[model samples]
Structures are given as C-alpha cells and as structure tokens.
Target: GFQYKEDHPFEYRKKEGEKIRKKYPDRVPVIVEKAPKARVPDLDKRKYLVPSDLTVGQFYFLIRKRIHLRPEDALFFFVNNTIPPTSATMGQLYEDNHEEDYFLYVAYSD
Candidate 1:
C-alpha cells in the first residue's frame, strides 16, 4: 500500500492478490514495509509468498537477518495497523487481518 502512489487503483491491488491466490492457493501472500522515515536497514524484498504453515516467529527472524540490525537496535512488526501474535501462522494472520486488497500487510520500524 505505501509502496504505491495514491493514484493507484484499489481494484488493481485486489486483482493482483486474487490472481496470485488463484495460482498459488497454498502460499500466503504478504507485503512488508517500514514506516515513513524509518531508520532501519532497507529490506531486500517487500512482497513474499511464504508457505501457509510458516510460523510468525520464523518470519520475524528471517526479516531480522535481512536487516542486519545494529547491536542496540531491534526490529518490530505490526500486522495491519497493530502488533501481531508471534504464536500465529502467516496463514491465520492473513485470514484474520488481511487488507481489503487481499494481501497481508506488515509494517515494521524501530
């Protein structure tokens, strides 16, 4: 969502996820991004199609590795607009709070 400009149509995003899910029903669709002016290291990829069974803890570690955080700096994640339960699976998270466009939106900062 933040990756695209304001002019981008909502339906375009909906169809993108709809098509991906159609072809890859077993994969969980996710979109991750840092907050505006976030000082964290740049992430290599924003969109991920991870396995449905992937644990939130594993994904968190995967993202941390990508950032290479500073010794005192730590990473945190928010699903939709709030914190997520680390105990949940990506599939369940998506099912619970996925965006209107069909992607599980993740925001990280600090």
Candidate 2:
C-alpha cells in the first residue's frame, strides 16, 4: 500500500496506535501535510559534509517552531519517513534557518 527508501535507518514497525508510544516515548509519530518543494541551495548541499551541526532532536524541534507547526504536527517533506532526521528535509529546515545554531539561536538572533 506504500513505498519507502531501502537505506532508511529507522525501524518503523507497523503497530496499533497503542504500540508506537512505547518505543517513541518522546516523539509523537504523526502524519503531516506533504512537504513543499524548494530548490536546494548549493551551499546547503556542498558547503558541509552534512547539513549543520545540530542534532536530530534539536533540528526537528526547530522546524516545527519555524513553520509554526502545532503540537501534533511536523514536517513530512520527504517520501522516506525512515531516514535519519538529519538526512531528510528536516535538515534542510535547519539550513533554512542557517544563522541560528538551533531554536535558541533564532531567539537570540532576533
């Protein structure tokens, strides 16, 4: 019924809603509105070996805040739900807010 990348690192066990919370306690697994298309900046692709220095949890929270996503929402900008958050568009979001190291960086930047 669906498709995904073979190399995606996380294990997504299809379970009753009751089961997801046991493993992903800190996160709220969600289905979000599709990701918007954007031209990837060359610097975003080339300047660093990866995106920026932020960790996955830090980066995801920053995106949710940037797009003003609600508590139960998050960016699902890529087809692969199983990649490391750093390997997905969540990182691009981090790139979009480049001057800020993390969400706090944005508050400080302003």
Candidate 3:
C-alpha cells in the first residue's frame, strides 16, 4: 500500500488567501495575552494578523490552534475579564480595547 500526503484545501488557501486579503483594508493585528497562571505556552511569541470580519468564536479556534491546545484543554478569552459574545466580530473587540496597551487580553481555566 502506498499513501501520499497532501495539503488540506482550506489550509492551502489559508496561506495564499492572506496575501490576497492583505490588499484589502480589513485585516487587523492583535496580541494575545496570557493571564498570570494560564496554561498556554510561549507567551509573546507572535502577533496575529486576523481578519476584521472574523467572529469571536472563530478567533478562539485560531488561538487554540496557534497555541497547540489539546482537546481536553480549556480556554477563555476576554478583555479585562469581560468575555465577548461568540457572535462578536474582531473589529468590535479591537475597537472596545483600542485605548488599552494590549489589543486583546485572555484568561483561561485550563
């Protein structure tokens, strides 16, 4: 038997798609903050360039993937401990905390 690995269609587009999206005016840069005792690793690793149209729920998964959280792990994101609704857009989150030094702050229970 022979098996060949190929890139997932969505993943292929994800990398190239950002280049396309970069030409537009909707991308926003945000920093992910780890709380005092958060379980996530490598804080201050990278800055996330996210689409402004992304929902809070979607953003959660993105962070989860970037941080390599296991399935059993749990995470909760917020600004000053105020959780944004899953339906909230990234743009809204950015605007709400634009005054603060950090773009977004996260607190987790894992």
Candidate 4:
C-alpha cells in the first residue's frame, strides 16, 4: 500500500511544514487520507489548513461536511492508529500528535 510518508522524506515535509507554520501561525497543516480498504470517497484535497480553535469533534464534522456525508452516516478519525478525544482542541492535537515532519496526520476508514 502507498503512504505519504513513504513518498516524502521527513526532511522535505519538515521544511514544508516549517515554512507553512511560519507563514500562518493560527492554522495547523494536516495531511489527510483514508485507509487502503476504506469505502468512502477520497477528498478533493489531501492537505488542509485546519483551524486551531476547532475541536477534534468539529474536525470530524468538517470532514463529513466536505464529503457530503448523510446526516445519519457515521465516520471515525484516527491519529497514529489511535482515536483521540473529541473534546481536545486541534491546536493541542497538532502539538501532541503530529509526526516528526510537523504535520498532523489524520486517517479515516469508516
């Protein structure tokens, strides 16, 4: 299976993230993708500048909105293969969960 980390070196992504962080301090740069067998449609964009103030629950809602998911449909988000607390702030997660490249990695599989 293909993964962004495999294609891009940490040094390259780290530099990119550094530049973005310097330019836009309020937003967190996120690298988003789906699991290999996930059934949902891939997002139009892979990288997103998520609002720092938004909570993890709100971030999930944003993705549902972006994908035009039915109100009744449910989805799950994972970071480092673990589910995060919905109440946690995006900024907090950005700092705590981000990879060495300095970009928060989010994956959806359902």
Identify the candidate with maximal lDDT: 4
Q: Could you tell me every candidate's TM-score relative to the true structure?
A: 0.86, 0.27, 0.61, 0.88
Please, what are the lDDT tens digits per residue for candidate 3 over residues 1-110?
00101222445434544553456458755545565566666544435667888998898787777778865678777565587788988877877763223234344334
Best of the two (1, 3) by TM-score = 1
TM-score of 3: 0.61
Give stretches of model 4 more than 4 Å off: none
What are the lDDT scores of the predictions, listed in order? 0.81, 0.33, 0.59, 0.85
lDDT of 4: 0.85
Quick one: ranking by TM-score, best first?
A: 4, 1, 3, 2
What's each prediction's clash count?
Answer: 0, 0, 0, 0
Worst 10 residues of 1 by lDDT: 1-10
Model 2 weakest 10-residue run by lDDT: 101-110
Worst 10 residues of 3 by lDDT: 1-10
After superposing all C-alphas onto the true structure, candidate 2 shows an RMSD in angstroms of 15.2
Ranking according to lDDT, highest score first: 4, 1, 3, 2
Candidate 1, 37: how far from true, in Å? Answer: 4.8
Cα lDDT of model 4 by residue, 1-110, tens digit: 32778888889999999988999999999988886877898886788898898898888888888887875787888787688888998899899898777899988867
